[PDB]
A = this chain, B = another copy of it.
Amino acid sequence: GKDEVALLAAVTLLGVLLQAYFSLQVISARRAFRVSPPLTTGPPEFERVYRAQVNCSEYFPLFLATLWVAGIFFHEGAAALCGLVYLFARLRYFQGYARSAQLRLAPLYASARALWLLVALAALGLLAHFLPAALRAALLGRLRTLLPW
């Protein structure tokens, strides 16, 4: 039961750890540019690192949501592998963005490709669990009993 989802839980935990890493980098920039809470503005370099962390934070719940839907309704290994590709592409996005706004783009598109792939696996998984049942009911003349609307 539990170990049917243990790989998804492991990829989730690795994402939490990546977020802690991004957070550690912003704490470091905060010393390196004397940025003092409660402020988020500062030199362009600090501003880039800080924006990279905010962006990764916005998308972290989206990644988790699709990872779990894809892993449960499609295939656990397929979703987990795709989750790892997304996480590694985000690490590179962060490191890229810290150096320059242009250098963030190649790993940003790689991560966008990986997240859309997870959205596609989630959609396919959901369709695989609804379309066959609807097909069976339609062929048996029992569709109204499955969905009156």
Q: Which residues of A contact B (CB under 8 A)?
A: 2-3, 6, 9-10, 12-13, 15-17, 19-20, 36-40, 44, 47-48, 50-51, 57-58, 60-62, 64-66, 69, 72-73, 97, 101, 104, 119, 122-123, 126, 129-130, 133
Contact = CB atoms under 8 A, between A and B. Distances in A.
Interface centre among A104, A122, A126 (most CB of B within 10 A): A126
Given A37-B51, A101-B37, A16 B65 contact: yes
A37 B49 CA distance: 11
Contacts of A12: 65, 69
A36 B47 CA distance: 12
Nearest to A37: B101
B2 A73 contact: yes
Given A37-B51, A38-B51, A44-B38, A126 B69 contact: no
Contacts of A62: 16, 19, 60
Nearest to A45: B38
Contact of A6 (B3, B58, B130): B130
Contacts of A19: 62
A55 to B, nearest CB: 9
Chain B CB count within 10 A is highest, among A44, A73, A130, for A73
B38 A47 contact: yes
Given A38-B48, A58-B57, A126 B73 contact: no
